[PDB]
Amino acid sequence: DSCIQFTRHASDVLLNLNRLRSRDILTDVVIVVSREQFRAHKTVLMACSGLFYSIFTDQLKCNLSVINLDPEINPEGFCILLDFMYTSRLNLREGNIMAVMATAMYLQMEHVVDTCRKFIKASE
Amino acid sequence: DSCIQFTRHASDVLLNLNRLRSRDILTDVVIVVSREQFRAHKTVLMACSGLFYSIFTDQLKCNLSVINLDPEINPEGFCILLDFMYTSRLNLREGNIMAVMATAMYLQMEHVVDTCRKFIKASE
């Protein structure tokens, strides 16, 4: 086609989706990770995670307002990945890398798994 | 903070949101523009348009599944802007520029209004 493109558009959309999340506006699911709860938008979760994409395209699970993650999942690891989904920013630190990598593998977030593997390999 | 950032993340999220729209997955509103209907995600509309941001933060309108636009709004102009919201790509042409600009003014999409004004000024 003969389209023009606004470079910052995708980043501006994501910033606004994060602002809606922070104000709990039109959030339609709560992700339960052991004792912790995280409110989010199903569409953002699906757009970022192979696991959520599978869950919310399921004819029964698409209608659930609560999703319980595997008890082995670390809430802080999930929190870091949820923030990444809404911001493109990953708070990767020596103290959380193992939990973040395990959570990203479970959530099927290949690019996060990739950088975790690379950061781990550099430290050995 | 000491975060790392994945450059293509925002673009990949938007591509997936557009894929969900094309397959009518978790769309929660229909925008009626005279004889035409457009299914979309309320959160994407709010993230792109000052008018939809106002509408879906309203305590009554947030719950509506159908939104009827002003009868003066051109469906093709709306279609072009809806595609832009989900892709960052604007199909701006001599034959549609006036309709696109009027629709963007109504929808409160300042960056689109700006490029329409600039393209019009260059042709006079």
Binding site: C3, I4, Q5, F6, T7 | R89, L90, H111, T115
Partner: peptide
Amino acid sequence: WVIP
């Protein structure tokens, strides 16, 4: 705005 750019030519993509």
